[PDB]
């Protein structure tokens, strides 16, 4: 019954232009997800032709 982390705001989305990122403080876990239809390490290109 617990839930409280930190959602990476757009002001800190420099490591992912078109992608999201969840940073867990209590559990040092800086995870960074990106739009499935995205390309590039920093998420700068896009390929969602689908």
User: Is 49 in contact with 40 (CB distance < 8 Å)?
Assistant: no
Closest by CA to 42, choosing from 23, 18, 26, 12, is: 18
DSSP letters for 1-50: -----EEPPGGGTTS-TT--EEEETTTTEEEE---TTEETTTT-EE----
- Phi-psi label, residue 21: left if phi above 0, alpha if psi -120 to 50, beta otherwise: beta
User: Is 47 in contact with 37 (CB distance < 8 Å)?
Assistant: yes
Give the CA distances from residue 10 to residues 1, 2, 22, 46, in Å, rounded to whole numbers and listed in that order. Answer: 28, 25, 12, 18
User: Is 37 in contact with 31 (CB distance < 8 Å)?
Assistant: no
> Per the structure, how many domains does the chain have?
1
Question: What span, in angstroms and rounded, lies between the C-alpha atoms of 50 and 42?
Answer: 21
User: Which experimental approach was used here?
Assistant: NMR
CATH of the domain at 44: 2.10.25.10
Domain extent at residue 43 = 1-50
Question: What span, in angstroms and rounded, lies between the C-alpha atoms of 3 and 44?
Answer: 31
């Amino acid at each position: 019954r617990k839930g409280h982390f930190s959602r990476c705001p757009k002001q800190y989305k420099h490591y992912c232009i078109k992608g999201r990122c969840r940073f867990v403080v209590a559990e040092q876990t800086p995870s960074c997800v990106c739009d499935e239809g995205y390309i590039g390490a920093r998420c700068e290109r896009v390929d969602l032709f689908y």
